[PDB]
């Protein structure tokens, strides 16, 4: 396995998420929600919260164990490899193909947080932000697809929606939601076995 950096997938985006339309602007919703669904197929969490911010971000809340806290090699967070490190998966190219990205980390009775800028770059590390009950566990991810790669940047509700209700659907036992912060719609999927 030869390990990449991010400007592999700037440079040849198509490769990774099919095209640079809007087929492939949900495909980096598609990662980061599914990364979400994976962990409540295994158990951990029973609501996964999707929102379309009204600057154009999307956030994707669950309430899973919480990515890795602790540190790789050198200082460097493991979340931080994660995210910026292609094993050429999901989570290092939406990085790359975002002008920022977020995510947030609670446990242990901690939160943290580590942003990137510009398509994966690193302005800070992961930190703690804040506290929580010892029981809340739970990632944040919120990104902002870069204009500059995509042409558009415009999230389609219903495209989201459906996809969302497919989910909920396989999952089973697990609430997933989508707000639309630019009109304000909402809804919630949830089926019981
Ligand atoms: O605490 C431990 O020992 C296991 C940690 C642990 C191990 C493997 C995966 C996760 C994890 C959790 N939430 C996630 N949300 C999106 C991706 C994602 C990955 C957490």
Known sequence: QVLEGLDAVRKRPG???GSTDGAGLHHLVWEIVDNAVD???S???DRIDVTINKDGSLTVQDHGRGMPTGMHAMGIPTVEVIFTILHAVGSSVVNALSSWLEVEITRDGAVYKQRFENG???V???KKIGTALKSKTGTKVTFMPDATIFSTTDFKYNTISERLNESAFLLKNV???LTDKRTDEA???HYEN
């Open 124 to 126: 800070t590390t992961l």
């Open 43 to 45: 158990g951990f969490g």
């Open 175 to 177: 609430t997933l939601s």
């Open 120 to 122: 994966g770059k690193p």
């Open 39 to 41: 962990e409540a197929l």
């Open 187 to 189: 809804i919630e999927f």
């Open 15 to 17: 490769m990774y998420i």
